[PDB]
Amino acid sequence: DVQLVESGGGLVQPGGSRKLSCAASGFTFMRFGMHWVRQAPEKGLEWVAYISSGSSTIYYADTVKGRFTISRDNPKNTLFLQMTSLRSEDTALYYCARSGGIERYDGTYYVMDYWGQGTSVTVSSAKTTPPSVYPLAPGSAAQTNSMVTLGCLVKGYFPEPVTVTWNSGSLSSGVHTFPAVLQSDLYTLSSSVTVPSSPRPSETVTCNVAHPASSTKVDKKIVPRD
Amino acid sequence: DTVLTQSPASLAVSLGQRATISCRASESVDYYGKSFMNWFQQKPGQPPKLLIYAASNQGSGVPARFSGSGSGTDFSLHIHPMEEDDSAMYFCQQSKEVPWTFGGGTKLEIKRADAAPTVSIFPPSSEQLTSGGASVVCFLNNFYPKDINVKWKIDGSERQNGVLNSWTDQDSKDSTYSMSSTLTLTKDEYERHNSYTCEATHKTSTSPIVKSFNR
């Protein structure tokens, strides 16, 4: 049914420009007003801009009013957000949401009833850096019950994100991939897996790490120390 | 603009119980006999979802457990009975004036029994030492509540510098939390010490859980 897919996000230098798109399907696009809402890292939702079905009414957030331009192409079923003079504070995940009308006996109340997954915009001058991936294997005094915990440290990449999988997705249970922490314009994240003791090193355990922004993909086998 | 004060900033409710979130508007959001007050549910890594529109009207695929009440400047979202997949961030929003404004949000978590963490420590990898680096990692998995302190010790001496932490969000099946802590030194400084220790104090005990290895 109703599907909204944003795209175009990425790393942009401060003062830069960037155009985001939002592809609509599953509804009659030309009939609905549309919005752009952003969500900064560890922040609430902040409304960015609105556009009526036929582009007659356009509304913007004060902090965006001069630098951002919202538009739509009804025939192509696409909503856009042109961004210029990007500021670090524009770093956020951008969502396009539909303005759906709800019928009452007296009128139609509008609300953002459908939202997209969003596109991430990072306004920074830090350089795109690939991750260094390291295996986390138990130390010599490796005492362990029925299960063993292993892991991978993905250090120094920029910008977000990085996807982490274990044994190409086969190992999905008992996995904890912690959010990345930004220290001195470089991200670091780690991931753990707990596998039965009998399976390691008898069966192989490897973490697959991909950093889209750098076309990075790395496989890192966890081999026993010693 | 009409500012929305959402309380509490976070809460923990037991399954079966009611979770109520409040939202105060700086200005009345009533307009033509209706209240332009809406509520969204946002699951981690997921987009927001409409729950209630016009103060008390449930959206499309919204369970009867989700209710909403209020008018003027006084509004609340109610969730009863509280269930497993209810753990999420919730936001109120007014649609009466431009700009559209949202509450600060509230993290709703499932209050489950206290569980102590599973602590495991890891030494720097050969490959990292080759690079001239040395990160020591400590995983503190599956505990409840989220509050927990981890101290790093090097030859018994507490270390404060070069350590990065991170917490997972409340898990979907067990409703627990997990934390990660990494201490990074250079290969040369790491090689200057013998003992590295991850010590964690959590509500489930007085004495901390200790994991360590000697270089």
Partner: peptide
């Protein structure tokens, strides 16, 4: 009355 993007009277 009509509030663009918010309320449209019948």
């Amino acid at each position: 009355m009509s509030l663009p993007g918010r309320w449209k009277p019948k």
